[PDB]
Structure formats: C-alpha cells, structure tokens
C-alpha cells in the first residue's frame, strides 16, 4: 500500500505543517479549579485574572487551528486537517482559516451536521445530573477515509492535541494519520492541552494518552500537565517546602518563584525512544527542554501588566507551539545543538509574550517580524 502524488518538484521553501483535529473560534480546553473568583457577573474585573492568572492558565493553549494560524503568521505554512459543518459557522471557520492563509485541503465539509453543535442526552444517575453524547460534532467525527494524503505527504510536522482523544472516531482517524505521516517521514508533535475530562485522575489519563505519547516524536506539556502526569502532590510538597533553620544557598533566601527544572530521571517514566524533544512550558516564563542527549531550560519572561486593559492570556501557548514548529521546520539543528535549540526557543517565548497583549487568540498571534523584534529587544544580543 502506497500513495503517489505524481509530482516531483520540491514542494515549497517553508515546509508544511499539518494541524489535525478541531477548529473553534476560540476555546480553552485546559480548565481546572481556581482559588480566586472575581465577581460572578461583572466581566469588567476578569482582567485581574488575566494578569494574575491561575498557573495552569498562565499560557493557555487552544484548538490546533490557533496553532495553524499562528504558525502561518510567524511565516511558516500550515494545513489544517479536520471537519466542519455545511452550516454558516463552518463556512465562517473555513473563511477564518483561508483569510489567515491556512491551507484547507484536508478540511472536509459534513453536510448533515451543525459544526460546533454536539447532541447530548441529559441523564440523572446517583441523583446527579449527567450528560452522554448522542451525536458527536463534525470536528469530532472526521473519518480515516477523509484524510488528505497529499497534505500528510507534504507536511513535515503533524501537530495534534489530546482533545482528539475525547472522540473514539477522531482517535482512530488520528492514529491512521500518524501512520501515514510517519510513513512519509513526518515528525509527530503532541501538544497535550489536556481537556477537563483528562484532569480527573493521573493514572487514567496516562493510559488514555499512552499510545499518542509513545507515537509522538515531539511533545509539549505545560508544567501543570507534566506534574499531573507525574505526582502532582510530590511536586506540590517539593515547592511548598521551606528550610526550617537556614537556606542551603543564598538564592533560596530570596523567596523568588520556584522555577524547578525537572531532571531527566523524573522525566524517565514519560521518556521513550522516538521522543526527539520534550518541552515543559512554565507560562512564557520558562521552557524546559529535554532531548536524548541534553536537557536544559530557556529562561523566558512575561509582561502583561504592560497592557492591563488589552491583555489576554488566551492563545499564548498556541503561539509558543507555533514558534517551536516554525523554528523546528527551518532549523532542525534544534534537535542536535543545545545553544541553537535555546536561541530558537527564545523566538517561541517572544511569540507567546506578544500573544498575551491583546484580547482574543487569532486576533493576537504575532508576525515573524514583531516576534523577532521582541526577541532582540528583550534578550541581550549574546543570546539572540
């Protein structure tokens, strides 16, 4: 079994990325309980929760379409592979993709379903209200026979996120797409972005994502996701610990935020032979990186109080992922030279930072020029 395009020209200079899954206008999958509510009705105060945010929400990821848009705007090329309804909103989402110059040849167009609309039956069990899905939405119901193999052939990175694992159909389609991409020599990028149901328990999610994680050649996990896949409570005790009598070094006296760098031995339960790069993101504040040969941490920064009224965290993680892919496709020494990897990941940091300064995700993804400008203004020239 093989697929032939009948074309021999070298495609095009910025290598294509395929982003698989769902498209929503903007949508945060990673949700957890937060300590501080603002007023339940006055939305005029929720800025205070985008500038002093929950730590899981410090740089939210989103739909892979956000990553496609950001990657194209950062100068790369993205194809979005997915399904939408024939209704007006599926057209609006495809138009959003096209206007952002995301290639939509793998975007199918179900005619008998209503894009974002999922049918669910509300039920009562244990006296609690529950829902069960009666029909999955278009974006959850792309079939393995609807994949565009010309895209998977061209695409050098196949990016997906764990939300596809919440649909058995989309999960089967995902693994077929992964097989195709790996056959065409693609690299599998797995942006975890754990949705709400996958925060229920560590040892269920770890087996749910196991096959996806072991297929991925490159993985992005937030600090909170990694610590949840590892022992969340052990790392809580790790960082709530304070020496009883005296600090073991001077810096531990300063009481600054704990930027703990997970060791390769702590990552070892998650590491696997195909994994070329794991990135653990602590906001834009730090990107820890791990490879088979070296590990380290890109010190980033954020500012968000620079734009108290216009700031919004949403999509900063998508812009980080897009910047990582943008450099991975055009500087594959990232897998082999540690200084190169750091210097290029600082571009992802800058893209996340700029993405935090406007309301809305797609509205806010930076261009390549703005990102490189922010890199060169924030970082000392030695470390550009």
């Amino acid at each position: 079994v093989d697929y032939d395009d009948g074309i021999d020209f070298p495609y095009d200079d910025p290598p294509l990325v395929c982003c698989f899954g769902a498209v929503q206008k903007e949508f945060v999958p990673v949700v957890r309980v937060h300590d501080n509510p603002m007023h339940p009705d006055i939305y005029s105060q929720w800025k205070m929760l985008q500038w002093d945010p929950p730590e899981f929400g410090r740089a939210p990821g989103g739909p892979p379409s956000n990553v496609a848009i950001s990657h194209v705007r950062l100068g790369g090329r993205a194809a979005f592979m997915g399904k939408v309804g024939g209704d007006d909103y599926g057209e609006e989402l495809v138009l959003m993709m096209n206007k952002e110059r995301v290639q939509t040849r793998g975007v199918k167009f179900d005619e008998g379903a209503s894009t974002a609309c999922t049918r669910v039956k509300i039920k009562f069990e244990d006296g609690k209200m529950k829902a069960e899905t009666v029909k999955e939405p278009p974006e959850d119901s792309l079939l393995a026979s609807e994949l565009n193999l010309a895209v998977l052939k061209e695409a050098r990175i196949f990016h997906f996120n764990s939300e596809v694992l919440t649909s058995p159909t989309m999960e089967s389609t995902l693994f077929k797409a992964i097989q195709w991409s790996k056959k065409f020599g693609g690299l599998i990028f797995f942006d975890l972005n754990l949705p709400l149901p996958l925060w229920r328990s560590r040892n269920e999610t770890r087996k749910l994502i196991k096959k996806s994680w072991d297929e991925a050649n490159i993985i992005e996990v937030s600090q909170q996701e990694l610590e949840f896949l590892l022992d969340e409570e052990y790392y809580e005790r790790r960082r709530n610990y304070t020496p009883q009598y005296f600090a073991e070094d001077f810096e531990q006296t300063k009481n600054r935020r704990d930027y703990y760098h997970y060791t390769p031995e702590e990552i070892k339960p998650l590491w696997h032979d195909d994994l070329k790069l794991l990135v653990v993101t602590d906001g834009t504040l730090r990107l820890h990186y791990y490879t088979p040969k070296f590990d380290g941490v890109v010190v980033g920064t954020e500012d968000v109080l620079i734009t108290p009224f216009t700031c919004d965290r949403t999509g900063s993680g998508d812009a980080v992922v897009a910047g990582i892919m943008r450099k991975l496709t055009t500087c594959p020494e990232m897998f082999e030279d540690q200084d190169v990897l750091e210097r290029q990941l600082r571009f992802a940091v800058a893209a996340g930072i700029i993405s935090q300064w406007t309301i809305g995700a797609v509205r806010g993804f930076p261009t390549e020029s703005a990102t490189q400008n922010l890199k060169e203004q924030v970082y000392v020239p030695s470390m550009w």
Binding site: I42, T310, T358, P366
Partner: protein
Amino acid sequence: DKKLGRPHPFIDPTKKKQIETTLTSDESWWNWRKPEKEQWSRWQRRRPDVETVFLKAMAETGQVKLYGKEPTLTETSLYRARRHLFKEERLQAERERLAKEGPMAFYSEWVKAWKRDTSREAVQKHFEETGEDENTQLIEMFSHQTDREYRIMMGTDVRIKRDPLAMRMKEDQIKQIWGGDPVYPTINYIQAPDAVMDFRGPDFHEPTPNMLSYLKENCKVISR
C-alpha cells in the same frame, strides 16, 4: 587606495592598519572593567534609519560598496550628507534609460496589462501597418493603464522626480525604515469608523444609577 582614494569609495583608514592589545580584566580598576555578563540595555539594538535602508539598497545595486554587510553610523551620516548626489545620479540614469528605451518600453513598467512588444523596433514595425504612430500607440498603452498603476507611475512626474530606488524598494526592505512590525500589535489600536462604543463592554464601569433611583433603592429617600 593611495591612488583612487580620490574619487571612488575606499576604506577611510588605509588597509594594513595596526591593532593594539590593552588591559585585561583583573589588570583594571573596578570602574573600568567589562562586566562578566553582557548587560541588557534599551539602546542595545541598532536604530533603524532611512539612511541604512537606502545605503543597503545602493550597496546591493552596486552603486556603492560598504566595508561590511551593514552600514555603519559613519557611513549613514555620510549618506545623510550626500544622498542628493546619488539621487540625482539615479534620476539621470532614469532619464537616459527613457531616452534609450523610448516611452513605450519605459512606461510599460506601469502598464502590466500592455502585453505587446514595446521596443522601438516593434513600435516602428507596428507603425508600418496599423498607421498608428508612436504617439497613438503610447496613448493606447496608457489607455490600458489602471488608475492604481497610473498613481504609482506619477512618481516619474517631472515635478515630483521621485527616487527611482524609492519607487522600487519592496515591502520587506521598506519595513526596515522603522524596523519591522511594531512589537505591540496595531490591531489593539485599530477601531472602525462608525463603530458605536459598547459602554457595556469590559473596559467601562458598571452603569451609574440615577441618584434618586439609587437613594430610593437604598431606602434613604421615600415617595409616600
């Protein structure tokens, strides 16, 4: 250098210049030491100038040569002192290209819709049948010019005398005048005309109540 350092561009200091070695750190007072880590400064990044983009564009067109791939501040200060010479030289080369090519071939730069052969030979060979002299052909060519192309061509107006290079710098080069896209995205500033402000939006205070309505609500004032 020694000869032909008059006229043409040449390295200001003569080649084979000597270099010197000075006090390393720990040979120097603490106030005259380079810090062990390069310090962040807002001024760390070369200011983007019009003179840098123009001097790079002249270097790539070979009108000038530079000591390195980036024009120094000395070179851009000299360009600032001398740019009108290079501008008038380019305008003269443009006049001479007009005289050589003829108006059809020259102005066809701004008539993409004019697909026919514009060389003087082809203009003659067309006059030898269609009876249309060069002028009628030129009127027809301009009759295919779109309004936007004409507005771009108006840089060649004999009163404007727009720089032939400024007319042809591409976007990714002109961007370097201000230094690429602004870091803070302009979409934050863009507002539509005829947009009506949503005073219920998330950057307004909650609507102030009518003072009587508020006092009555708080049972501070009574009606009957």
